Write a protein that binds this ligand. Structure first.
Ligand SMILES: Nc1nc2c(c(=O)[nH]1)N(C=O)[C@@H](CNc1ccc(C(=O)N[C@@H](CCC(=O)O)C(=O)O)cc1)CN2
Ligand SMILES: Cc1ncc(COP(=O)(O)O)c(/C=N/CC(=O)O)c1O
Lengths: 402, 402
């Protein structure tokens, strides 16, 4: 008996995705073959352990799948070791923290208010419950990270681990300077590249591998793969330690159907067409930010080096919460985000975060960004209307999903 | 470009699953419609938070999918609250422990060799690293749990959490007695029903929900659903606390395509056919154990009340690792497994574990178990041969796959 109610919902969700403009920076649209792998019979196999050293019979083929994912990840990113088993970015970070630190140790990471991830030290998160968290942020005048403030905090608090990488930072990271600071205090440098991993793979963002002790990531977001986590390093000895924290430390059976999907995503990212896609992602984001600046918004840091940017809404007297709702009502999804010099509180904010990976996957090009900018502006100033919702729909339907 | 090498490996795994006898007790074969949901576009949405309380917009349809999974889980097990976001059985247990305990608190669980799971207090697992662990076992003569030994231990060590449930215990649990013991020391009773969740849903195993404070489970064993975790409780105030430990405590975005698969599996488990399937699972396991006993194999506790059994291979001079390899060579997939008081470490073991869920899904009946027992016996005594493999293959191919 088919579950009609459930599949009626899936068809509605497919329609919602086709007919809207997805501008949330951490979203993307996976290919059909990534979905085919994730929907495969590989979910039926228990395969605890690692290739050639499993706790169950029958893993001969699974071992070739997981080894293929590992070797492709190492070739794509220039790594000496990889672990493709983390269920999510959260589990990847948790395993690294538990391998390098003991409860009570100090963790330094980017403040949630300035763009950090929950996993970089939130007190509601495991990172803030097991460890002592010290946070860094951005300067109000530069709207950028201050490496001298980072170093000062590191010398004063002596973290065991310093995390670089964030969720809403629109400029390049200086991984070399972060590693120098870490070395000065004897800390490990962990880079969480989840947001910009696809740009690293395409050569459009500095690669953290050579400077970090360990690199964590999701396989979704700019890498355009299935939902899951990833760990990389140039140190196989440290990798062996982390392998043990993933299993038997924090996980049980790996999701080998999702790992097959990671293998597919790494194959796609190794093709030359991926570099072109990634170039367009960054060109779209720079062009869309410029077009909104021309229409009266201020762009934080004045622009972006990557796939996302932050819009200061104060010139138009809007809060991030109101802009979110007005845009959601016409099928444009963004999220509110604090700006560095923000007069409003966290639940309201004076900004929004926009990202181009998902619309770029649907074939949007830089010459269409003026039109996207005008729809956003109209929705913010005129508010939601049926005519505007129909224009978004038409535009969206004219750009196919994978 | 299609990833031809990866899909060739998936086709090889499909063939391996169709042409062998999958007797791993923790595996099953999911239906086509479960795979269809897991391979859906719902992977493209970041749904941090809970239904009606998400961080990001655009979740109106996703919320109906998750609520449907939640409400079906409640109806299936008779629970007042459910959480369907855990990525795995291990994450479900982690969230529960962190909601009920601080690090350094005392956790009581079943010894691994006696049957307990890694997350029930193993030193190489987070459960044994973060908490002080006290373990109960089984009696050396009957290989059954002694409730008076469990009581003594609880009164002596005063655990904060007692865990009932196991990965390799073949008999029924007395959840009323475990709750009485927990109440005597003021402990929470947590039941991990991962292995026998489908038998509970079908009414063939005592239901822990009235007696446990919290129930954890996986969705992919006896329940025959996608790979993932589940938490249930009759206390909605305890559920609220646990919800916060799942997010933002230990996970980020949930896997909503997998949650759609969970909704489908719950729909299948609510059908009358699922009760007939589950009855045959247990009938097959009892008959196969009896047929191996008649050939001189020692069955731990003498038999089974559920879907699995353990074979003590010490009298036959075989380690569990050797038996697993011999059986695998002829297409019979089991896992080496620790037995009560095992002198050998988990990488070697003195036994094997066998379960019927997967072959029962393929339509194997009790009258076919004598033939299965014969093939197992021959591979252990006579060793692998080409003629034995072929016989296994024919028998397997005579049964369809979902
Ligand atoms: N009773 C029981 N049987 C079970 C499990 C379990 O948790 N309990 N498993 C649940 O998934 C699987 C076995 N998985 C296991 C993986 C690692 C270790 C363990 O103790 N590993 C050590 C030592 C290895 C050695 O020296 O032999 C380690 O990794 O250091 C035990 C079980 C299948 N059967
Ligand atoms: C009681 C119990 N609790 C938790 C888990 C972990 O579930 P995951 O493998 O993390 O999905 C398991 C899995 N056990 C795997 C096996 O038995 O072969 C379990 O038997």
């Amino acid at each position: 008996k088919r579950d009609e109610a459930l599949f009626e919902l899936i068809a509605l969700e497919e329609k919602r995705q086709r007919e809207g403009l997805e501008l949330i920076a951490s979203e993307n649209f996976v290919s059909k073959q990534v979905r085919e792998a994730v929907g495969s019979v590989l979910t039926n196999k228990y395969a605890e352990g690692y290739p050639g050293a499993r706790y169950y019979g029958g893993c001969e083929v699974i071992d070739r799948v997981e080894s293929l994912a590992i070797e492709r990840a190492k070739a794509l990113f220039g790594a000496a070791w990889a672990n493709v088993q983390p269920h999510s970015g959260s589990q990847a970070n948790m395993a690294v923290y538990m391998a390098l630190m003991e409860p009570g140790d100090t963790l330094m990471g980017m403040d949630l208010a300035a763009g950090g991830h929950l996993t970089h030290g939130s007190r509601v998160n495991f990172s803030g419950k097991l460890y002592k968290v010290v946070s860094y942020g951005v300067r109000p005048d530069t709207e950028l990270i201050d490496l001298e403030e980072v170093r000062r905090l590191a010398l004063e608090h002596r973290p065991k681990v310093i995390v670089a990488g964030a969720s809403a930072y629109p400029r390049f990271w200086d991984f070399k300077a972060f590693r120098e600071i870490a070395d000065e205090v004897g800390a490990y440098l962990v880079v969480d590249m989840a947001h910009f991993a696809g740009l690293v793979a395409a050569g459009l963002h500095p690669n953290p591998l050579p400077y970090a002790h360990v690199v964590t990531s999701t396989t979704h977001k700019t890498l355009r793969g299935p939902r899951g986590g990833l760990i990389l390093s140039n140190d196989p000895e440290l990798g062996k330690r982390i392998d043990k924290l993933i299993f038997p430390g924090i996980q049980g059976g790996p999701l080998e159907h999702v790992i097959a999907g990671k293998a597919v995503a790494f194959f796609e990212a190794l093709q030359p067409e991926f570099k072109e896609y990634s170039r367009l992602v960054v060109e779209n984001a720079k062009r869309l930010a410029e077009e909104l600046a021309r229409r009266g918004y201020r762009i934080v840091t004045g622009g972006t080096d990557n796939h996302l940017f932050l819009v200061d809404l104060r010139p138009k007297g809007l809060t991030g919460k109101e802009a979110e709702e007005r845009l959601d009502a016409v099928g444009i999804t963004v999220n509110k985000n604090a700006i560095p010099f923000d007069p409003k509180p966290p639940r309201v904010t004076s900004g929004i975060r926009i990202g181009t990976p998902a619309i770029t996957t649907r074939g949007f090009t830089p010459e269409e960004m003026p039109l996207v900018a005008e729809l956003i502006d109209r929705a913010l100033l005129e508010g939601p209307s049926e005519a505007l919702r129909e224009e978004v729909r038409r535009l969206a339907l004219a750009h196919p999903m994978p």
